[PDB]
Write a protein that binds this DNA or RNA. Structure first.
Lengths: 114, 1388, 58, 57, 63
RNA sequence: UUUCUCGU
């Protein structure tokens, strides 16, 4: 009975592609509508379609670049900075470290200042 | 009329809104921020603000400010000015120094009695008898200038506060003007405002009563820190191990406080953003000391980033706010100049110097988080941040949601299997594959390593039947709470002042009030439930099953500023009564049903938690992340997917999903007395009110407090998914806002690598994965919240590693003063609170003398120097205390009233004394009975004035002080009344006016009468029948010959009166009784004088307990030869209660009955205790032995085979209570009918039907293995968990001796207290001798040993009275077991 | 081979069931509760069934 | 044999449940405030017929 | 052996129409009477099965 | 002085 196996390979492969579609399917939250005044439905759609929707201002979101990176499953620079093996310092922190780890040059141990 | 009593401690919120409004009205311009608050305050002011401004001194001050002589400033600026007082004079400095010297000397004198008792009981080795305290007093002669300055500032602020409180009590609407108490200052302090003016510096401000309380508390906290550090240093100077673990010179501490105040002043209110990082910085130094190279530098750099970013944000917010306001000319140039870098660097460097590279110092530095004060939280800004976070769209992969729901389903299945040995009943048995169908049929579950992503995806699609049940009758104990609620949507404007509301809003409120019931019109839980006349018992169940909370037209959420919170924001919220009922019910069912499937929830100590938690290469790690803001990252699509599982399990629609089904459609509005939103015209509802910074809509998020347990279990499921995806184990310890992770993963160690630089790689990979799946599920946690570690464990704000705990005792005891944790300025409650707070020092920091001396300092202050200034009654307590002192002096042979006061302070508080925590608390926390401990404590105290060896038991002596005391305790007139009900309320009660009466007993009456005249039928009838039920419940069991207080307590718990009296006791703790329903926050004079007379009677208790003539007038006194203290206490209890025999409660005092010997002899007969760690100072070092939890002996009962889940928690508890009743009262003549009708009344079953449900017990002795809620369940030592690990114990000689004498029978003594006493005594000997003993043995005294065999009761319980009490209190019974619930108890 | 391949088809179908049920649960939201169709979406439960039963029997 | 028959005899209900999930999703997604009244009065009719059917027998 | 083939054909038709419903679903959500009636029937029969299960223990009680 | 305020 190889005929039935050959004819069910088709349903097997289309079930596999339905599973792939389900895996790539993305769902959004039911946030407020544009200009408020109502509740938007928890819309569901294809992945790349809603990356396009986010980048076309279809839905208002505080996060755009990192949300896009997460949706497309790519490593973002913000995530890399958060999970960096060595973290650097902004200039204020660099100055603070210089004053902390350096000898007291001015020795301004006076409350009358600042 | 009614009097207003103001608290002496803030215990509330410093409100930015009210301060801004008051300043704006006073100065005719925007004061703190350009909001609608200032506009409405200037337009239509409050009556109190008008009264404050109309004062002549206020008019002069505002005229001077308008003239430009003085310039407006900030509460933070004046906080800095007060902290750096720099205005003291020689006279007041000398007076303050003399007062502090007297306080220290008196505290040391009081401490000498306790120390001498400890020493002469231990056998180790003028006004002061012990050489140790003599040297300590000789060292602590001159307090330093910093200590004197802090004491003087605290004393002046406390004097101002107590003067204002006394005047406010005297007359209403008082304003205190005090330009003389503080030199150069000026206070116009009132309840509704506090204006501080500095004539010398030409500065003025507007503050609040809460801000003034905060200033006083800052001063008091610095005084406490200074006193503790000075005492610890002076003790460590003479003995290194004697004092606390930390060491400070305290000049660094004073400079640090000054620099913190300077930072706050420079950055104004927004400086608390920078101040919030002190704890994190301390943690950074801790990681620098402990952690490896990579982790320490990573955290240090990341948090330098955090601190500088927070400082920049604070500067930007300050500049933005200050621009268009009256404070624009106040910003310091150093803020713009950027020179604040130097000041902040100095602050951090001095913090590091205080730490001194010492782990104990840094660990205990966590009090700096609370010293610097609390911010004035801005409601509008925090709500704007919450709106920005929540009101956003979150995009989820459907795969991620499926994985989370499948993980939650897997947790549910695992919990059900492990608990009830079976899978839950599920609808969709066809959706499972063959493998999962086999796992369903054979009721087991697969492991995580044997489970896959395919399995998680498959398990997502399941639908269950009911396994758990909704309680039909609403839980009154659950819903009744002293806290407040919010009015409905149409009545939300009633939470704002009438002046702040527009005229049309006022008219709408006045028209709508008649359209609403008397209950929901209120704002308090008690008033809402009491005024609910049409309150049906099955109302919450009907609402839940009908989904009445969904789409409710009158639902509105109101959120107010947090209390005593330094964290900016954290805005907790309130909700109307019915929706609050739904929320609390959902949380209760989650906790009582599903939380058993998630042991990591940690619903709890820390130290034990950590200790069971502690309980080619394997790589470990540790990640700690914050979850205070997590709650905002949970839409419907992420929370309700797992909430549907609970909905199905309880078979109820949208019970746990109510949040993201009704919160979205309600309006989130700011609610405070001085933060109103702009309305406009012809708009009378929030759904039409335009949204601004004050209010918004469409939350799309959670709320603090609500659904915390649901989000916790969802997070646990998320971490289980994390572990599945990453192939590693997780040991999460999530609790509240703090989450702890312990990831361990075996690895194949590549060549040339140690255990380091591989745990770091594991940490980085796990952090990347963790970040990825929180991002996928919605949460966007940053590097601010989380950090990584290797050998450090952090939770509940605690420090430890290597098994050695480092405490925060100074932080715990920060706020200790005259009237703490009290209501209506109660004296005994203040004494108890001081004692409890000061124990923490010796319970956590391992310092007996530091804690004891601190407690004595504050107790002496409260007794002598603070009783004269009681707010309610001017001098009555002081006069009564003087009377008690003279009475004690006449009773004993004390030469001076000073010595009389010392003895009163050392006398136990049980007999109206002054010592809150007895001697046993210093060796073991819990005791079976309090009377024996009080008696032995009194004996040891009197051993100071009466020379006793305390090693030779109690041979008689020529001195008769102790003889007279014991004889007078024995001899008194019996006046029993309601004896049995009093035993059932308190099994250790004495009665016959021989014990101190607590406020509940006095207030129970007035609570009854006020509850009787209430609209609610349930409470009305319960109060109306309360006295008759009291009499019936008292005489229900007056016929049993041997009375068992614990069995009586079990009977009382089983009967429905227990819930009603719990409600009565909760109501009795409110501020005002008979004024609950009067719509006024003012205490009635009836409450005032009732509390006053109760306080006077409690003070004048030693007189009645100790008559001068020792009652009987004869030479026959209590002979002390061969005297047993246990027999003494048992006879005292029986004589006091006029009862022939009281059994089961009388237990020996282990401290008295166990002697101390440091070297063995020809006979040991003792509890051998030796230290495994061979070193002198075992403190701070962990041993190789398991910690001594000291749990009670395990009772032996057999679980009946039935369906547990079908029975509710209350029904199961009552079934267990009835099983205990059968176990204790098996030998009753009327037992059959008594249990039969008891079961018929309480449950829906008969005795024969319920007998198979009862977990029949196997232990034949109910005096030794009973589990009454009034008996202790654990007997731990005073020392913490880690210190108990350094010693080993054995009781074999004790077992031999107790089997030789009266063997094969149970004994009244408890061995857990024996072991705890031994360990704590070894620690105390180490403290007092600088060396830990090599081996210690505890020889007992057999005359205090009794055989507590189970008696055979003879009597008949009065069935008629039992029927009467159940019928009268028929509105408090739990859910009766219906037939349609019972018939499924015996299925499969 | 046929049995094993049919079983794997069954596993894929089980995944379809799970994903669609998760989407059904997450697709209700406050919008269904406001419009009163959440009960239709997720299904009637035992407490509501008891309410109907007691209303009938009364 | 009977194994394949039983397997397809569970696949048919699995597919039927997939159908039902798709039906509820499509009737809840499309028709902005158009079919919501239809589901509401369908639930009203369902509860009426359910209570009547419980009354019967 | 044609019964197995017919069953495979009908399940193939059902799965193809399933794919059609997913496509229409994503299209509609991006940017009915019979379908609604069928899902009313499904929820009604599920409620009926649950109610019969509950009446099972009700009858067990009534004994 | 819409019960000064006081959440889970």
């Amino acid at each position: 009975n190889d005929n039935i196996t050959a004819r069910l390979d088709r349903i097997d492969e289309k079930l596999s592609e339905i599973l792939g579609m389900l895996h790539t399917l993305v769902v959004a939250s039911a946030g407020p509508t544009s200009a408020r005044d109502g509740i938007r439905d928890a819309m569901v759609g294809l992945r790349e379609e809603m990356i396009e929707k986010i980048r076309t201002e279809a839905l208002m979101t505080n996060d755009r670049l990192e949300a896009m990176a997460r949706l497309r499953n790519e490593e973002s620079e913000k995530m890399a900075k958060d999970t960096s093996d060595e973290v650097s310092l902004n200039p204020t922190s660099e100055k603070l470290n210089n004053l902390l780890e350096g000898n007291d040059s001015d020795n301004d141990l006076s409350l009358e200042d600042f | 009329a009614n009097v207003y009593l103001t608290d002496s401690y803030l215990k509330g919120v410093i409100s930015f809104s009210e301060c801004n409004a008051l300043g704006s009205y006073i100065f005719n311009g925007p004061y703190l921020k350009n909001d609608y608050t200032n506009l409405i305050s200037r337009q239509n002011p409050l009556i109190e603000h008008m009264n404050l401004k109309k004062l002549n001194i206020t008019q002069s001050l505002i005229s001077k400010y308008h003239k430009g002589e003085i310039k407006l400033e900030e509460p933070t600026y004046f906080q800095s000015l007060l902290m750096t007082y720099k205005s003291m004079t020689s006279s007041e400095q000398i007076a303050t120094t003399n007062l502090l010297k007297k306080i220290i000397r008196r505290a040391i004198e009081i401490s000498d009695v306790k120390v001498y008792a400890i020493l002469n009981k231990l056998g180790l080795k003028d006004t002061i008898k012990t050489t140790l305290l003599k040297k300590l007093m000789c060292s602590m002669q001159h307090p330093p200038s910093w200590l004197i300055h802090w004491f003087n500032l605290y004393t002046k602020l406390n004097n101002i506060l107590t003067q204002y409180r006394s005047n406010e009590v005297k007359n209403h609407g008082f304003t205190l003007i005090d330009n003389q108490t503080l030199s150069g200052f000026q206070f116009i302090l009132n309840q509704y405002g506090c204006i501080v003016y500095h004539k010398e510096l030409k500065r003025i401000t507007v503050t609040t009563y809460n801000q003034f309380l905060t200033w006083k508390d800052i001063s008091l906290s610095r005084l406490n820190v200074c006193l503790i550090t000075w005492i610890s240093n002076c003790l460590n100077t003479l003995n290194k191990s004697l004092g606390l673990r930390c060491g400070f010179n305290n000049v660094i501490l004073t400079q640090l406080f000054l620099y913190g105040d300077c930072i706050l002043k420079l950055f104004h209110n927004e400086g608390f953003y920078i101040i919030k990082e002190v704890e994190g910085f301390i943690m950074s130094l801790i990681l620098n000391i402990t952690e490896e190279d990579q982790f320490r530098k990573r955290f240090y750099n990341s948090m330098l980033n955090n601190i500088t970013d927070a400082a920049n944000k604070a500067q930007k917010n300050l500049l933005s706010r200050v621009c268009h306001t009256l404070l624009d000319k106040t910003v310091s140039d150093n803020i713009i100049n950027g020179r604040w870098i130097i000041l902040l660097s100095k602050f951090l460097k001095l913090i590091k110097l205080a730490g001194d590279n010492n782990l104990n110092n840094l660990s205990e530095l966590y009090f700096l988080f609370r010293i610097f004060g609390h911010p004035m939280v801005d409601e509008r800004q925090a709500m704007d941040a919450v709106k920005i976070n929540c009101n956003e769209t979150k995009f989820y992969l459907l795969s991620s949601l499926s994985m989370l729901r499948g993980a939650f389903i897997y947790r549910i299945i695992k919990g059900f299997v492990n608990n009830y040995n079976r899978w839950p009943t599920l609808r969709n048995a066809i959706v499972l594959p063959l493998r999962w169908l086999t796992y369903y049929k054979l009721n087991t579950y697969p492991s995580l390593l044997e489970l896959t992503e395919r399995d998680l995806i498959v398990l997502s699609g399941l639908r269950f039947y009911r396994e758990f049940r909704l309680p039909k009758k609403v839980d009154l104990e659950m819903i009744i709470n002293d806290k407040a609620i919010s009015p409905p949507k149409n009545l939300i404007w009633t939470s704002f002042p009438r002046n702040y509301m527009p005229s049309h809003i006022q008219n709408y409120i006045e028209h709508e009030k008649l359209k609403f019931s008397e209950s929901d019109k209120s704002r308090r839980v008690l008033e809402y439930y009491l005024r609910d006349n049409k309150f049906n018992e099955c109302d919450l169940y009907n609402c839940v099953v009908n989904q009445s909370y969904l789409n409710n037209p009158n639902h509105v959420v109101s959120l107010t500023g947090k209390e005593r919170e330094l964290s900016v924001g954290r805005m907790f919220a309130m909700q109307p009564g019915m929706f609050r009922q739904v929320q609390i019910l959902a949380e209760k069912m989650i906790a009582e049903n599903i939380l058993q499937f998630f042991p990591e929830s940690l619903t709890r100590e820390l130290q034990k938690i950590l200790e069971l938690k502690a309980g080619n290469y394997i790589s470990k790690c540790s990640i700690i992340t914050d979850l205070s803001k997590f709650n905002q990252a949970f839409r419907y699509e992420t929370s309700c997917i797992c909430s549907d599982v609970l909905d199905e399990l309880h078979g109820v629609q949208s019970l746990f999903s109510w949040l993201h089904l009704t919160i979205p459609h309600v309006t989130i509005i700011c609610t405070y007395r001085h933060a109103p939103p702009y309305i406009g015209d012809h708009i009378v509802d929030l759904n039409n009110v335009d949204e601004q910074s004050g209010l918004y809509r469409y939350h799309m998020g959670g709320i603090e407090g609500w659904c915390q347990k649901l989000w916790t279990i969802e997070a646990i499921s998320l971490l289980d998914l994390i572990s599945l995806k990453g192939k590693f184990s997780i040991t999460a310890l999530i609790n509240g806002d703090n989450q702890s992770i312990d990831i361990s993963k075996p690895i194949r160690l590549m060549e040339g690598q140690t255990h380091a630089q591989a745990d770091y790689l594991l940490a980085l990979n796990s952090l990347k994965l963790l970040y990825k799946e929180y991002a996928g599920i919605g949460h966007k946690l940053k590097g601010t919240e989380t950090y990584i570690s290797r050998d450090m464990q952090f939770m509940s704000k605690t420090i430890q590693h290597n098994g050695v705990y480092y405490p925060a005792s100074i932080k715990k005891v920060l706020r200790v003063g005259p009237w703490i944790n009290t209501i209506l300025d109660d004296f005994k409650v203040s004494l108890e609170s001081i004692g409890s707070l000061t124990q923490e020092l010796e319970y956590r920091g391992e310092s007996l003398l530091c804690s004891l001396i601190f407690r004595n300092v504050w107790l002496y202050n409260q007794i002598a120097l603070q009783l004269k200034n009681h707010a309610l009654c001017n001098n009555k307590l002081y006069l009564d205390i003087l009377k008690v002192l003279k009475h004690l002096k006449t009773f004993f042979n004390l030469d001076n009233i000073d010595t009389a006061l010392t003895l009163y302070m050392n006398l136990p508080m049980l007999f109206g004394g002054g010592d809150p925590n007895l001697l046993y608390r210093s060796f073991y926390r819990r005791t079976p009975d309090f009377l024996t401990e009080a008696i032995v404590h009194s004996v040891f105290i009197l051993s100071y004035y009466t020379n006793h060896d305390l090693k030779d038991k109690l041979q008689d002596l020529s001195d008769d002080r102790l003889n007279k005391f014991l004889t007078c305790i024995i001899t008194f007139d019996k006046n029993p009344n309601a004896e049995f009900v009093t035993l059932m309320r308190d099994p250790q009660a004495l009665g016959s006016e021989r014990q101190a009466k607590i406020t509940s007993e006095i207030n129970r009456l007035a609570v009854t009468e006020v509850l009787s005249t209430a609209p609610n039928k349930i409470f009305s009838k319960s109060a109306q029948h309360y006295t008759t039920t009291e009499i019936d419940l008292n005489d229900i069991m007056q016929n049993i010959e041997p009375t068992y207080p614990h069995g009586l307590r079990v009977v009382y718990e089983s009967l429905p009166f227990y819930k009603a009296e719990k409600i009565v006791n909760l109501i009795s703790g409110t501020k005002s009784i008979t004024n609950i329903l009067e719509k006024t926050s003012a205490i009635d004079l009836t409450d005032i004088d009732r509390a006053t007379e109760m306080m006077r009677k409690n003070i004048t208790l030693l007189i009645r307990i100790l008559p001068l003539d020792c009652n009987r007038d004869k030479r026959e006194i209590l002979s002390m030869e061969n005297l047993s203290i246990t027999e003494l206490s048992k006879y005292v209890r029986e004589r006091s209660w006029s009862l022939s025999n009281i059994v089961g409660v009388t237990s020996p005092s282990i401290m008295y009955t166990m002697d101390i010997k440091y070297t063995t002899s020809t006979i040991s007969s003792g509890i051998i205790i030796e230290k495994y760690n061979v070193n002198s100072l075992t403190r701070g070092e962990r041993g190789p032995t398991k910690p001594w939890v000291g749990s009670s002996t395990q009772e032996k009962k057999t679980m009946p085979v039935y369906n547990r889940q079908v029975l509710t928690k209350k029904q199961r508890d009552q079934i267990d209570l009835l099983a205990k009743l059968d176990w204790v009262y098996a030998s009753i003549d009327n037992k059959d009918e008594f249990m039969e009708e008891l079961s018929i009344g309480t449950l829906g079953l008969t005795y024969e039907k319920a007998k198979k449900l009862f977990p029949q017990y196997l232990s034949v002795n109910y005096l030794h293995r009973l589990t009454v809620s009034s008996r202790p369940c654990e007997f731990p030592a005073s020392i913490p968990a880690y210190r108990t690990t350094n010693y080993h114990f054995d009781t074999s000689p004790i077992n031999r001796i107790l089997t030789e004498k009266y063997g094969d029978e149970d004994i009244d003594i408890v061995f857990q207290n024996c072991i705890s006493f031994g360990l704590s005594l070894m620690s105390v000997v180490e403290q007092f001798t600088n060396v830990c003993p090599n081996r210690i043995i505890l020889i007992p005294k057999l005359n205090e040993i009794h055989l507590m065999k189970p008696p055979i009761f003879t009597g008949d319980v009065d069935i008629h009275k039992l029927k009467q009490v159940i019928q009268k209190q028929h509105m408090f019974l739990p859910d009766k077991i219906s037939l349609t619930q019972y018939v499924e108890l015996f299925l499969s | 081979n046929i049995t094993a391949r049919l079983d794997r088809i069954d596993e894929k179908l089980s995944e379809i069931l799970g994903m669609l049920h998760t989407l059904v649960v997450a697709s209700a939201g406050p919008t269904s509760a406001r419009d009163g169709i959440r009960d239709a979406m997720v299904g009637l439960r035992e407490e509501m069934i008891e309410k109907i039963r007691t209303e009938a029997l009364m």
